[PDB]
Write a protein that binds this ligand. Structure first.
Ligand SMILES: NC(=O)C1=CN([C@@H]2O[C@H](COP(=O)(O)OP(=O)(O)OC[C@H]3O[C@@H](n4cnc5c(N)ncnc54)[C@H](OP(=O)(O)O)[C@@H]3O)[C@@H](O)[C@H]2O)C=CC1
Length: 162
């Protein structure tokens, strides 16, 4: 149960759809890590995603709609439901990409955290959700910088104690 998403100084993530910043290093590493695994995505995501479903990977959709049909990915509407699936898949890992409400649900049921804090300060209508930082301990931290001062990101890891 790990979360993977991009954000700015304001903690942003998207602009009424998704990350509007061109982060090639994020995508490349994103797919390089989500290879042969399972990624959970929100409703607005599957519809507001540029790569739906993601190639060479296992996609997972999370929408309230009961009659929702997501071809190529797994469909569910409850937090407990999808959890049963993840259990049935002991050969894969859980990776949350979006949306904001999705991270919230697992926010409590989460174990690992992976965030990319950009350097530039952007403004939108979608910010990250609160998390129990105390209950989570930083596993790793790497500050990556590019030619552009705004293209500088920081990769941080977090794992719940015990
Ligand atoms: N930087 C990034 O990687 C990403 C950034 N973003 C940004 O964040 C914004 C929000 O994410 P987006 O993908 O659009 O949002 P989603 O609608 O996909 O995710 C949140 C919504 O999913 C539904 N949902 C969440 N948890 C559950 C649950 N346990 N059971 C059932 N339904 C659930 C709810 O639907 P509702 O309440 O609609 O009924 C909730 O409002 C995007 O518009 C974009 O700007 C989005 C994706 C990735």
């Amino acid at each position: 149960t790990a979360f993977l998403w991009a954000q700015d100084r304001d903690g942003l993530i998207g602009k009424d759809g998704h990350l509007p910043w061109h982060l090639p290093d994020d995508l490349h590493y994103f797919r390089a890590q989500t290879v042969g695994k399972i990624m959970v995505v929100g409703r607005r995501t599957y519809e507001s995603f540029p790569k739906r479903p993601l190639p060479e990977r296992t996609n997972v959709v999370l929408t309230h709609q009961e009659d929702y049909q997501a071809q190529g990915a797994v469909v569910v509407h409850d937090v407990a439901a999808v959890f049963a699936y993840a259990k049935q898949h002991p050969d894969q890992e859980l990776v949350i990409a979006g949306g904001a409400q999705i991270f919230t649900a697992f926010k409590d049921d989460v174990d690992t955290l992976l965030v990319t804090r950009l350097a530039g300060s952007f403004e939108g209508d979608t910010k990250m959700i609160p998390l129990n930082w105390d209950d989570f301990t930083k596993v790793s931290s790497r500050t990556v910088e590019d030619t552009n001062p705004a293209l500088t990101h920081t990769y941080e890891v977090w794992q719940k104690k015990a």
